Amino acid sequence: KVFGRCELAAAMKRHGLDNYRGYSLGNWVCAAKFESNFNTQATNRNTDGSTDYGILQINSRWWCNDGRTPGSRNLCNIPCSALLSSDITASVNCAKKIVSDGNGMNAWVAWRNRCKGTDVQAWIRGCRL
Ligand code: NA
């Protein structure tokens, strides 16, 4: 599923992401735009053999199991495929663990490089929230 911008903002807000670990909602929408283009089925293979899954491109080295990332963890206790669903519940709940890992949203390289320090409120402009 490819979310509309405000459609995603709404779903993220309902799942408690607005100011989760102090990151306002626009951060998460920004991250999702550059990570997945709002597409829940996005995947990317990493050079270390791990794979990123879903709307927030969550990685198999630590957070989900795909059975093909040797020596990896599954700290969100989910199959990575769950991160590709049209329902973003699994992605949001896993993201909450990632962002609590110590480095905040810097865990997402795209957020650090393209959202951090920008006017992220623009990503929820026009949205009925
Ligand atoms: Na990415």
From Swiss-Prot:
Tissue distribution of the protein: In the egg white and polymorphonuclear leukocytes.
Reactions catalysed: Hydrolysis of (1->4)-beta-linkages between N-acetylmuramic acid and N-acetyl-D-glucosamine residues in a peptidoglycan and between N-acetyl-D-glucosamine residues in chitodextrins
MF terms (GO), sorted A to Z: beta-N-acetylglucosaminidase activity; identical protein binding; lysozyme activity
Localization annotation: Secreted
Annotated catalytic residues: 35, 52
One cellular component (GO) term of this entry: extracellular space
GO BP of this protein: cell wall macromolecule catabolic process; defense response to bacterium; defense response to Gram-negative bacterium; defense response to Gram-positive bacterium; killing of cells of another organism
Catalytic activity, EC: 3.2.1.17
Domain C-type lysozyme: 1-129
UniProt: substrate binding residues: 101
Pfam families: Lys (PF00062)
Keywords noted in UniProt: Allergen, Antimicrobial, Bacteriolytic enzyme, Disulfide bond, Glycosidase, Hydrolase, Secreted, Signal
Subunit structure: Monomer.
Role of this protein: Lysozymes have primarily a bacteriolytic function; those in tissues and body fluids are associated with the monocyte-macrophage system and enhance the activity of immunoagents. Has bacteriolytic activity against M.luteus.
Entry similarity comment: Belongs to the glycosyl hydrolase 22 family.
UniProt name for this protein: Lysozyme C
Source organism: Gallus gallus (Chicken)
Gene name tied to this protein: LYZ
